[PDB]
Tab-separated table of C-alpha atoms (C1' of nucleotides) in Angstrom:
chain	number	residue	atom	x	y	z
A	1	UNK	CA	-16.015	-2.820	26.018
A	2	UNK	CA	-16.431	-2.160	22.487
A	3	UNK	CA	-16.770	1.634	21.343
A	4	UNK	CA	-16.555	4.151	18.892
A	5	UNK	CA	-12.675	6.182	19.334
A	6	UNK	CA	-10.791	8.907	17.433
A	7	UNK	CA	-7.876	8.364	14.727
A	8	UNK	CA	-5.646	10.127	12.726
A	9	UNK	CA	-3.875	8.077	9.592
A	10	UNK	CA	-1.918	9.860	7.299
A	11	UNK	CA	-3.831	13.508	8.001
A	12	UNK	CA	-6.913	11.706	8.019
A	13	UNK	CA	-9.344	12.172	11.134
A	14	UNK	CA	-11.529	9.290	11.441
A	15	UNK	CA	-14.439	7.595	13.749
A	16	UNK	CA	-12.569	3.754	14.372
A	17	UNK	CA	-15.413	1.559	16.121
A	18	UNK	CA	-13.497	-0.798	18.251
A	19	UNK	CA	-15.248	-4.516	18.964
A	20	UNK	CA	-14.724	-7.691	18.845
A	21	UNK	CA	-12.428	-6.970	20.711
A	22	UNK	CA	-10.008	-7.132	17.826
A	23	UNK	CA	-12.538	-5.697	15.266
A	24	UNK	CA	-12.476	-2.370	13.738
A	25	UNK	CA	-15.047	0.019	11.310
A	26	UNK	CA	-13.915	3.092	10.458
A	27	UNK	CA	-15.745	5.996	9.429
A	28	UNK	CA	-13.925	9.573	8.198
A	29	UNK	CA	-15.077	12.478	9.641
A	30	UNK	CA	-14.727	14.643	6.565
A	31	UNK	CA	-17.189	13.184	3.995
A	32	UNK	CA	-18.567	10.436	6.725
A	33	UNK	CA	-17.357	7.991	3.899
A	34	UNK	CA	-16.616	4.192	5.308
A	35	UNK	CA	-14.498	1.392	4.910
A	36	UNK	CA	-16.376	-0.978	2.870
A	37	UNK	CA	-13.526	-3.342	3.257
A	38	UNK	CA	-13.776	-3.633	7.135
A	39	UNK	CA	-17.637	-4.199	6.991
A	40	UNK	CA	-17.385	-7.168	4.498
A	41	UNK	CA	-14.501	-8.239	7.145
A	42	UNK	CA	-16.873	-8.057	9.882
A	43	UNK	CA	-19.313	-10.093	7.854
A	44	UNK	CA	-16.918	-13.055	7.881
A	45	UNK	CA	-15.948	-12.966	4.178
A	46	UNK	CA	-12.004	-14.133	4.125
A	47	UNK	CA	-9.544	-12.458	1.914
A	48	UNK	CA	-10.574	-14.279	-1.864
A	49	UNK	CA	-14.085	-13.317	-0.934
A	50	UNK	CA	-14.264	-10.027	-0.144
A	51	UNK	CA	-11.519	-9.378	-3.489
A	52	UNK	CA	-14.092	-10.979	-4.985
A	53	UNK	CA	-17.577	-9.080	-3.949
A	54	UNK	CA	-15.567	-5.778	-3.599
A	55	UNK	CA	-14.433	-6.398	-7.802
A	56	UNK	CA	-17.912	-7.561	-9.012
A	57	UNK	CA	-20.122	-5.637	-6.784
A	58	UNK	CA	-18.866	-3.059	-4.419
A	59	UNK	CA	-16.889	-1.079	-7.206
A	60	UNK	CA	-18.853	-0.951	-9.319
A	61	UNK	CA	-20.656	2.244	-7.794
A	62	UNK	CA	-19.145	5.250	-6.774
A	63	UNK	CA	-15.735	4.328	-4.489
A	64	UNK	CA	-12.564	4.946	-3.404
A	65	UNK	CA	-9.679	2.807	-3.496
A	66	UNK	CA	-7.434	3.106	-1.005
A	67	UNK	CA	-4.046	1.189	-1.672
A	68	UNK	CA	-1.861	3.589	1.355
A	69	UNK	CA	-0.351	3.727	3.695
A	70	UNK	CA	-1.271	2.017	7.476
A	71	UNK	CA	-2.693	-1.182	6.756
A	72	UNK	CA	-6.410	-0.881	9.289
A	73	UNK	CA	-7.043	2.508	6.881
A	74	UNK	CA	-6.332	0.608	3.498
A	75	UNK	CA	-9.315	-0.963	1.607
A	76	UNK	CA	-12.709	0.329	-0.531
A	77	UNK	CA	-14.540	3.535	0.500
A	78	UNK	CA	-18.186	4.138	-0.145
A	79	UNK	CA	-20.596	6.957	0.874
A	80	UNK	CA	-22.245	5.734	4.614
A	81	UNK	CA	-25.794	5.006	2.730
A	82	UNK	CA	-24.220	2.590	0.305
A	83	UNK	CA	-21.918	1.349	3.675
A	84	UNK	CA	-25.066	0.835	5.454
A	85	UNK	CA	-26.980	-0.810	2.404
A	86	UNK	CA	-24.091	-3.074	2.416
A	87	UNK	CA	-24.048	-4.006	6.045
A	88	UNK	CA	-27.952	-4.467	6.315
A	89	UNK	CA	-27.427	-7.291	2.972
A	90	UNK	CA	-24.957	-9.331	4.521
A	91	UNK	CA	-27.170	-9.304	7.407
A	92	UNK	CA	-24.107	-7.566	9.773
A	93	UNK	CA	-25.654	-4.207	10.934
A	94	UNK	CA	-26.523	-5.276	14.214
A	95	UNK	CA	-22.780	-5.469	15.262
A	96	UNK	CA	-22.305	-2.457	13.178
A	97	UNK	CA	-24.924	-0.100	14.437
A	98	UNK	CA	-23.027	2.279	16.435
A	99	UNK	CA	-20.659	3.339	13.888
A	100	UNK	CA	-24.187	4.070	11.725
A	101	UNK	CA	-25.979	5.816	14.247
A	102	UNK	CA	-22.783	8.235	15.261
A	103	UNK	CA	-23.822	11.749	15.246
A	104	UNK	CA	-20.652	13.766	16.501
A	105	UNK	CA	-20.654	17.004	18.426
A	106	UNK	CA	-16.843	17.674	19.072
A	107	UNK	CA	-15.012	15.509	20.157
A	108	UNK	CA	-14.846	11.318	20.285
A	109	UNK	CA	-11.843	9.963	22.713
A	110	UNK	CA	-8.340	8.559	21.685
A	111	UNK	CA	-8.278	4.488	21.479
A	112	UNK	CA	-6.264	2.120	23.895
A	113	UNK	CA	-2.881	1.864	23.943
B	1	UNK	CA	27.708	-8.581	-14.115
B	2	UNK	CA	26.017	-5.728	-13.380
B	3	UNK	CA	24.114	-3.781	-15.722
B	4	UNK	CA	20.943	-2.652	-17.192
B	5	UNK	CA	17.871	-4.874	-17.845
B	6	UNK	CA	14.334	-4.598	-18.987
B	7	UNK	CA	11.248	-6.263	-16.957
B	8	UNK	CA	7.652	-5.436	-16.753
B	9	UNK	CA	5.775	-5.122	-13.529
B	10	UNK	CA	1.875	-5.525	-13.701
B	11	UNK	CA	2.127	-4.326	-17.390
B	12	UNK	CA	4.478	-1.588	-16.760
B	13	UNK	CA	7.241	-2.163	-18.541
B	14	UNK	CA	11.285	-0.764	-16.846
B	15	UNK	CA	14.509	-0.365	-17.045
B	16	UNK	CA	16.767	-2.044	-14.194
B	17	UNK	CA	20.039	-1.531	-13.439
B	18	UNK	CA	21.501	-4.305	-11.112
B	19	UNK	CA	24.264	-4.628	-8.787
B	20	UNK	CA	25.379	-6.303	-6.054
B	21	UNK	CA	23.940	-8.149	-7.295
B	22	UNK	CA	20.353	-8.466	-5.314
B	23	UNK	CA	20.496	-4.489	-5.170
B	24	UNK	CA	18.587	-2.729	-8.191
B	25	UNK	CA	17.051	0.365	-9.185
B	26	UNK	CA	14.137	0.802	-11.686
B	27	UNK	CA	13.264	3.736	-13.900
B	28	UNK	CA	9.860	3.492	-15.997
B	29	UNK	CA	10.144	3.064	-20.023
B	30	UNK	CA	7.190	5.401	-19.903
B	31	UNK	CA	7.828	8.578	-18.297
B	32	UNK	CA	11.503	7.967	-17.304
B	33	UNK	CA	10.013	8.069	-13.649
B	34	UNK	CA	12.212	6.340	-11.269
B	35	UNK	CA	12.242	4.760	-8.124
B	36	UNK	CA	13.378	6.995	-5.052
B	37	UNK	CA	13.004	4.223	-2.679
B	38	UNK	CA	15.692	2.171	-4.832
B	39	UNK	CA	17.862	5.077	-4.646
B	40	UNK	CA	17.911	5.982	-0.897
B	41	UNK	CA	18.249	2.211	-0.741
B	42	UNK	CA	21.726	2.063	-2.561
B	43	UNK	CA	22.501	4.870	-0.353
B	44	UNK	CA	23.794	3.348	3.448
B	45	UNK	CA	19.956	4.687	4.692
B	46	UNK	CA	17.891	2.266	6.393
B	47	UNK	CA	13.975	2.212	6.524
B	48	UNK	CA	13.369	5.079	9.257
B	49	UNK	CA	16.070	7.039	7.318
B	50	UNK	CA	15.155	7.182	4.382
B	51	UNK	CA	11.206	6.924	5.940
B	52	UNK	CA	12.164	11.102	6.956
B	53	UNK	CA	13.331	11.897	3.821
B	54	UNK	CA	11.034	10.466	1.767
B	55	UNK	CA	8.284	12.402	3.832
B	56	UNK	CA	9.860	15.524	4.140
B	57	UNK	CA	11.865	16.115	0.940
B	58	UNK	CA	10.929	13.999	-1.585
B	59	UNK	CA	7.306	14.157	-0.938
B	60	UNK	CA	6.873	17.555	-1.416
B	61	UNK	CA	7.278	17.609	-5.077
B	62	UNK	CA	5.889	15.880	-7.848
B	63	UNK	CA	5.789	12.581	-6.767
B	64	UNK	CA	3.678	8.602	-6.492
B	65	UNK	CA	3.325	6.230	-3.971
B	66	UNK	CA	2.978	2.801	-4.901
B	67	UNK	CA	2.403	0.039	-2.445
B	68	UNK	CA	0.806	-3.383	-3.005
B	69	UNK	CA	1.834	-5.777	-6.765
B	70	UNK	CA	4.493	-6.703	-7.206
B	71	UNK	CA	7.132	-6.226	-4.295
B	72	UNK	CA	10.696	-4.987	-6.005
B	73	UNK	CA	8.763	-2.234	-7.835
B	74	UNK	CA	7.032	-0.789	-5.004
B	75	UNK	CA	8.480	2.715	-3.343
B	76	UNK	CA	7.925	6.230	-4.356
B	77	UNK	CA	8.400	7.565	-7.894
B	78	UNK	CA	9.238	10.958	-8.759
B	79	UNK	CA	10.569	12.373	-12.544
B	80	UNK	CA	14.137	11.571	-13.431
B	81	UNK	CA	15.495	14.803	-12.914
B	82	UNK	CA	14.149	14.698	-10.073
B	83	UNK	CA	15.642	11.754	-9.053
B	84	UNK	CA	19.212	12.463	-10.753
B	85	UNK	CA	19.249	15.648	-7.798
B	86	UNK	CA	18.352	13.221	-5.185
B	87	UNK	CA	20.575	11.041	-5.879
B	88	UNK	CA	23.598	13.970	-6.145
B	89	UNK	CA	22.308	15.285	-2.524
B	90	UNK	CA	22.631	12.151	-1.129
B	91	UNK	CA	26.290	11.273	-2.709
B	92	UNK	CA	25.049	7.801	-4.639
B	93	UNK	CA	25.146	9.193	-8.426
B	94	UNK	CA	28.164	7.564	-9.287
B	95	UNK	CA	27.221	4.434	-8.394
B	96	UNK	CA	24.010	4.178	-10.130
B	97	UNK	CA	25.414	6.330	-13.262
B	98	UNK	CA	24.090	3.725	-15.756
B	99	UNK	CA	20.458	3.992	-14.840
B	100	UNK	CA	20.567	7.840	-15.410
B	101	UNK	CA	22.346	8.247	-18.294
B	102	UNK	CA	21.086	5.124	-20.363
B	103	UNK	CA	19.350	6.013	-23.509
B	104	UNK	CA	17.691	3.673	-26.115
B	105	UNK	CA	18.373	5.840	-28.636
B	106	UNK	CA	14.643	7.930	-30.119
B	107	UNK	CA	13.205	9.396	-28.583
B	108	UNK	CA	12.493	10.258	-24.434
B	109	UNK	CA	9.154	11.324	-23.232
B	110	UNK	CA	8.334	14.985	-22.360
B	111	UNK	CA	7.792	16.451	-18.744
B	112	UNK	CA	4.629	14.809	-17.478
B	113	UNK	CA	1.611	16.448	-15.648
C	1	DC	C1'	-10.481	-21.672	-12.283
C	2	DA	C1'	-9.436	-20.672	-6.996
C	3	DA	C1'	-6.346	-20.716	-2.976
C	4	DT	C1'	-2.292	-18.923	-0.696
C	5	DG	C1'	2.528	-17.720	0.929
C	6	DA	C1'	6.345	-14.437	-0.307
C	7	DC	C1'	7.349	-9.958	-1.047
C	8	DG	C1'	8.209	-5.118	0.942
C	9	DC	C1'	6.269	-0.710	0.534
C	10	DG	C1'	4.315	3.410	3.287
C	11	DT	C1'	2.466	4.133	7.824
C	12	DA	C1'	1.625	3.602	12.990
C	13	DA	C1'	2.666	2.473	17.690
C	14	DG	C1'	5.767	0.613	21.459
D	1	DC	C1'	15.257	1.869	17.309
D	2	DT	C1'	11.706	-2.148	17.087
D	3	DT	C1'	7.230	-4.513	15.757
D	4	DA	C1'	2.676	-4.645	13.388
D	5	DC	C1'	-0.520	-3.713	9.491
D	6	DG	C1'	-2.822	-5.000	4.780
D	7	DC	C1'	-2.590	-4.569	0.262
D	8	DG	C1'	-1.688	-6.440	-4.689
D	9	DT	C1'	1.453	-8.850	-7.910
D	10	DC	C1'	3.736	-13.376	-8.843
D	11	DA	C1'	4.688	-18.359	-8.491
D	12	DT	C1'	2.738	-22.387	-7.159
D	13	DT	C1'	-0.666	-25.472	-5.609
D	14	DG	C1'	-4.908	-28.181	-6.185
DNA sequence: CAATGACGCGTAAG
DNA sequence: CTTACGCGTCATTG
């Protein structure tokens, strides 16, 4: 039952959309910013390709790096339209959509244990 | 034996005192940084140890986080006297004496921002 | 050129 | 306490 949850990684509140089942997205909550990393992930791209798109293409807009600390938060962070943009090229947004079409009123749940 | 060396580390060149003689601790050639992580590590802490007082001592000052490269020179930085005070609080600067008080001669960098 | 396992850090969760 | 996580270098391979 995949789903959009609540988490908190090193201060940092963020939307985590859970499918797959072992699949995650996550969106923060603060600048609604998202992990360009995990969508390229989701598109099937292993590890020398996504290094490679995320060099040459991703970064070469406006981004975030994010080398620390928990591993799932870790990766590239773009603004949601470039996100989105992203996700609707590699042809992925249809198992992405929720995490796109979140509007929050307070509050989403805590994730499974 | 044991003594002081000089490596580089993704271009960032260090001095390296080793003992032990896997054990080491680096302090930068640029800033005089050094590693806090390789301190706490000569120390008898362990990884939760030294996992508290990383976050709530060292942390709170003038300090960088670097995870990811290569693996030795990973751990958090913080200024030499800086580290010279944690390493008197937590009864190791004797042992690591040489990587404190070694001096190429002219001239060492100033305080940085 | 590209791939890939080792490394080991800061984090999180059991 | 224990494990799991993913990253970016380095050495090594094809």
């Amino acid at each position: 039952g995949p789903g959009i949850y609540s988490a908190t990684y090193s201060g940092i509140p963020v939307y985590e959309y859970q499918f797959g089942l072992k699949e995650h997205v996550m969106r923060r909550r603060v600048d609604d910013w998202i992990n360009a990393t995990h969508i390229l992930k989701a598109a099937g791209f292993d590890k020398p390709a996504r290094t490679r798109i995320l060099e040459r293409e991703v970064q070469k807009d406006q981004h975030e790096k994010v080398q620390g600390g928990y591993g799932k938060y870790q990766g590239t962070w773009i603004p949601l339209e470039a996100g989105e943009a992203l996700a609707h090229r590699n042809n992925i947004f249809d198992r992405l959509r929720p995490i796109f079409e979140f509007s929050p009123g307070p509050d989403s749940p805590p994730p499974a244990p």
